[PDB]
Structure formats: C-alpha cells, structure tokens
Amino acid sequence: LEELDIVSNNILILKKFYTNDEWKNKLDSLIDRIIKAKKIFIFGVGRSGYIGRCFAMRLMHLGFKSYFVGETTTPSYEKDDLLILISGSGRTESVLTVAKKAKNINNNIIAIVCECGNVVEFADLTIPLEVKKSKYLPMGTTFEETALIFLDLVIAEIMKRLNLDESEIIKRHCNLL
C-alpha cells in the first residue's frame, strides 16, 4: 500500500503550520486577510478549481461574502477585496490572466501552489504545499488532496478564533436541493 503511505505522509507536512513560526505566519496572514477583506474571490482550473469551490462554499457558510470567479452572480473585484488562487504548477494561463487583472486593482493576491511557477510573481503571499508525487498518483493529485485538507483546516481555525459553531453553517447552507 505505497499510495496510502504517500497520502498519509503528505498530510503530516501540514503540521508545520502549527509548530514552525515561518509557516504559522503564512496561516495567520491568510486568516487576517480573509477577516479584513470586503469580498473574497477564489479561482482555479480543473481539479484545483473544484477544491477551490469547496473552500468558497465553506467561507460563505461562515458569513463571509465569498465568490468563485467564473460563476453566474460573481461581481467586480474592488480595491478592498481578496483573491485566492489555487494552482499545482502555478503556470496555468487562465490563472495568470485572472492574476494580471486583479494586480491592476490591488496587491491582495494569495497563491496556494505546489511548484513556485509564474503566478507567484503576482502574489503578495505564497503558500507552497510541497507534496510527494507518485507514478499512480500523477499530475497535481496529491496537491489537490492536501490543499482540500489545508483549506478545511483554515476553516477550522477561523471558527475557533471567531467562536463560531455548526449552527452558523446550517443557517446559511443551501436548503433547496
């Protein structure tokens, strides 16, 4: 069970955000920017985008004005807003297009990447999730898994700091489907 061992050890890399000062600062900065922002925008392509949507939905559940770029009712990016980009290689052209346009409005851009590609040049804060890849866990597979877990841990930390319960989520959760 080589693949399960790789995934298990990849999740352990997230311990740095609680024990090491340089990584704790990245987590603290991400949370501080989320609380101070007027509106929060999330973007990613493919599987990185689906993981991005999971986080966007959860931020909305907590009461933030959260949006995913590309969707129906997503408005204009303004000066007091925040953009969070999720990309494996950090080289995806569609992610760079969104980064360039946001850069003309403000500097509040965060990049969650595996490899430090071109997108980091446009980011104010870069959060690298350097995970182990495998033959049977190709492309950004392990990054997408670890990024989802990291983003759920950010939600966990936001709930702790603002004293939010599960009741806040039920109140704002979709009830039509």
DSSP 55-108: HHHHHHHTT--EEETTSTT-----TT-EEEEEESSS--HHHHHHHHHHHTT-S-
**146 labelled ligand-binding:** no
Unique residue bearing structure tokens 């999740």:
11
**49 labelled ligand-binding:** no
**33 labelled ligand-binding:** no
Architecture label for domain 1-177: 3-Layer(aba) Sandwich (3.40)
**48 labelled ligand-binding:** yes
Terminal-residue alpha carbon distance, the chain? 38
Burial of 149 (0-12, 13-18, 19+ CB in 10 A): middle
Amino acid at the residue 37:
A
What backbone torsions phi and psi does residue 87 show, to the nearest 5 degrees? -150, 135
**92 labelled ligand-binding:** yes
User: Determined by which method?
Assistant: X-ray
- Which entry of 2, 121, 144, 166 is annotated as an active-site residue? 144
**DSSP 8-state class, residue 139:** T
Q: How far apart are CA 23 and CA 120, in angstroms?
A: 17
User: Which SS3 state, helix, strand or coil, does residue 138 take?
Assistant: coil
Q: Residues near 161 by Cβ (< 8 Å), separated by ≥ 6? A: 31
Q: Locate 121 and state its tokens.
A: 């040049």
Are 58 and 152 in contact, with CB atoms under 8 Å apart? yes
Q: How far apart are CA 68 and CA 45, in angstroms?
A: 11
Are 134 and 35 in contact, with CB atoms under 8 Å apart? no
Are 39 and 67 in contact, with CB atoms under 8 Å apart? yes
Are 83 and 56 in contact, with CB atoms under 8 Å apart? no
Q: Would you tell me how many other CB atoms lie within 10 Å of the CB of residue 1?
A: 7
Distance of CA 138 to the CA centre of its chain: 21
Nearest-10 crossing angle of helices 141-161, 21-36? 70
Q: How far apart are CA 121 and CA 124, in angstroms?
A: 8
Report resolution (Å) to 1 decimal. 2.0
Distances in Å between the Cα of 141 and the Cα atoms of 10, 79, 158, 164 are 11, 34, 26, 32
What backbone torsions phi and psi does residue 22 show, to the nearest 5 degrees? -70, -30
**88 labelled ligand-binding:** yes
Are 142 and 3 in contact, with CB atoms under 8 Å apart? no
2 given a catalytic annotation: no
Nearest-10 crossing angle of helices 141-161, 46-61? 10
